[PDB]
């Protein structure tokens, strides 16, 4: 039996964690959730003890902590604090067209690897003189190499064929240039993998027209924020795609789009698919592959049935009805 840290978060996070427990019970998953909560308090003791629990447990599943962007810069986003404190350098999400969710674009299969600790998320700002604010995007070699290694190793181990580095090196010459060059170095150690690159503007243009051309994508932190959300939307939206955060030792799983969904919380309408798929990836990471597969096939089977769809993807059913259908599909897999 494994012990996993669970941070319920804000918005739809709490309600969706309950269905995660409920689904794990019916599947008899050998996992005990050890909950930690994170308040609105400007004090950091909550976020710091969530960190230490993840250090203890090594694995966590979390909702999204809301960030109040009206508070002072000293009050920094807790999701970022977790990410960087724990040095979970690789944000990985896998957007694949779901045959039951029909959108404008078909045949999408994109692994996105996003540097998760550095970049314009460094939280380094200052006001030199009244009305003049500087913010320091940080790109380093060790972190650009690290993320590039991961994307290429991923590309090979999952039998992909093309990595595309996404960047603004033609204008951010030193910073984005350094990142692009770390990618190129790694590329030369994987001669069997096609290496390309593309400017982040033109990448968004290609995504909204011909997103089938992309295989694996690696990029620095902000561009990942953009590309994750572009591709989430292309395949159907925030309720569908899981995301993972990997460090050398620690791992934390969530929804790909990192959204609290406060405007739909507590109305039994949230789509549980992203959260459930995230908890299967957590099961795979824990080497509990048979449980991960049982639940993942159940949730995917349910998305095939239009009648189970929540309102985020054009449907009318409730969360609880979807969770019902998912449990009905498991309860026949294990006897």
């Amino acid at each position: 039996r494994h012990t996993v840290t669970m941070i319920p978060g804000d918005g739809i996070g709490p309600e969706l964690m309950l269905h995660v427990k409920s689904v794990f019970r019916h599947a008899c998953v050998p996992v005990d959730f050890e909950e930690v909560h994170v308040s609105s308090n400007a004090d950091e003791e909550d976020i710091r003890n969530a960190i230490m629990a993840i250090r203890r447990n090594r694995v966590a599943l979390k909702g999204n902590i809301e960030t109040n962007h009206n508070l002072p810069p000293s009050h920094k986003s807790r999701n970022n604090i977790l990410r960087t404190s724990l040095d979970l350098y690789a944000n990985v999400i896998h957007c694949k067209s779901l045959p039951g969710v029909v959108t404008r674009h078909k045949d999408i299969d994109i692994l996105i690897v996003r540097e998760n600790t550095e970049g314009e998320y460094s939280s380094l700002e200052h006001e030199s003189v009244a009305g003049v604010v500087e913010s320091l995007k940080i790109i380093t070699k060790a972190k650009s190499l690290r993320i590039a290694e991961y994307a290429f190793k991923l590309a090979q181990e999952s039998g992909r064929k093309k990595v595309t580095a996404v960047h603004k090196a033609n204008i951010m010459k030193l910073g984005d240039g350094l990142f692009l060059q770390c990618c190129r170095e790694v590329a030369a150690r994987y001669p069997q993998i096609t290496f390309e690159n593309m400017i982040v503007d033109n990448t968004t243009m290609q995504l909204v027209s011909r997103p089938q051309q992309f295989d694996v994508m690696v990029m620095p932190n902000l561009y990942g924020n953009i590309v994750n959300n572009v591709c989430a939307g292309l395949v159907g939206g925030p309720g569908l795609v899981a995301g993972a955060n990997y460090g050398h030792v620690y791992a934390v799983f969530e929804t790909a789009t990192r959204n609290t969904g406060k405007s739909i919380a507590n109305k039994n309408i949230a789509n549980p698919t992203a959260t459930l798929l995230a908890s299967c990836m957590m099961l795979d990471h824990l080497k509990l592959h048979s449980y991960a597969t049982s639940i993942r096939k159940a949730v995917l089977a349910s998305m095939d049935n239009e009648n189970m769809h929540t309102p985020d993807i054009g449907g009318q059913g409730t969360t609880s009805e979807a969770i019902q259908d998912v449990i009905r599909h498991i309860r026949v897999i294990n006897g």
């Binding site: 960030t67 810069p73 995007k137 380093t140 027209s209």
Partner: protein, 324 residues
């Protein structure tokens, strides 16, 4: 009848600049063209060009070939506001049909401040600059554009959760202007949410105002929603009432002189040009004559695309603009 500094530029620059002038007087337009060459020297842009623009105030610019003249013209004329209106086009159909967004990009500071330092070996700090002055000015321009172009909503786009001091002050200037202009409905939205919703339901967006790098990326994704840079008008507004309207597609040198190009985009920046001055009547006609040409059928370019050549396309626009 005033004069407009014309900048044909390279490759297909001249041909589509010819097509725009042909339609512009086939349509009674009180505009005559003062052609000019722009190019870095000594750097600088020629005396020839700086004084036409500082006299006429209005330029139209084709695809230049590749000091950045994009960056030169910005710093030479203080081009502080990039405007890109994206509208779905009937006849040229993409998976997105309901688009009608205007992106308004701050174009001077922000992430394109030009300041980068090598802190030590393998550690770069690129500096994003956000100022009271510039943020207020692009916000004032955003709201002023919304009224003069009859626009209901203006959204500020930001990431002040992550970049609190900088994106925050940008937002703080958008808020102060908005309370001084309740005529226009104002909201805020994170960049990633705007991206997430744009590719799902672009129809929910009106006027987007945002700092430099976000505006750079969003303007391109929006244009990707309506068909590409081959059909996209663009304008840049500067100090002392100068404005330059432009193509933003490439020069396409491989077909540079074969009557094969498509002048839609530059012709639509010209329309956007007139609207900027006044002459809405001419704008509406040229624009409607264009929109009707693309929808009606096989008088289409190869890149849009049918099997007709550029001045067949252009001449039908002349044919139809004469019947208002």
């Amino acid at each position: 009848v005033q004069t407009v500094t014309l900048i044909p530029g390279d490759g297909i620059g001249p041909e589509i600049s010819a097509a725009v002038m042909k339609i512009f007087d086939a349509a009674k337009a009180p505009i005559q063209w003062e052609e000019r060459n722009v190019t870095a020297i000594q750097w600088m842009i020629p005396s020839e060009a700086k004084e036409s623009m500082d006299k006429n105030k209005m330029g139209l610019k084709g695809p230049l070939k590749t000091p950045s003249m994009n960056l030169l013209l910005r710093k030479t004329f203080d081009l502080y506001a990039n405007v890109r209106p994206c509208v779905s086009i009937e006849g040229y159909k993409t998976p997105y049909t309901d688009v009608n967004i205007v992106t308004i990009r701050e174009n001077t500071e922000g992430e394109y401040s030009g300041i980068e330092h090598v802190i030590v070996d393998g550690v770069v700090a690129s500096i994003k600059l956000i100022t009271e002055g510039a943020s207020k000015r692009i916000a004032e321009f955003a709201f002023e554009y919304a009224r003069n172009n009859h626009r209901s909503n203006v959204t500020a786009v930001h990431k002040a959760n992550i970049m609190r001091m900088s994106d925050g002050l940008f937002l703080q200037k958008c808020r102060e202007v908005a309370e001084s202009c309740k005529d226009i409905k104002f909201n805020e939205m994170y960049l990633d949410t705007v991206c997430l919703n744009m590719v799902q339901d672009p129809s929910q967006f009106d006027v987007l105002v945002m700092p430099n790098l976000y505006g750079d990326i969003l303007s391109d994704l929006c244009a990707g929603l309506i068909g590409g840079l081959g059909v996209t008008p663009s304008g840049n507004i500067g100090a002392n009432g100068v404005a330059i309207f432009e193509s933003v597609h490439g020069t396409a040198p491989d077909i540079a002189g074969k009557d094969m190009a498509n002048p839609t985009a530059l012709l639509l920046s010209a329309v956007m040009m007139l609207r900027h001055m006044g002459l809405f009547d001419h704008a509406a006609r040229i624009e409607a004559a264009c929109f009707a040409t693309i929808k009606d059928g096989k008088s289409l370019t190869k890149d849009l695309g049918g099997n007709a050549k550029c001045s067949d396309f252009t001449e039908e626009i002349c044919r139809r603009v004469k019947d208002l």
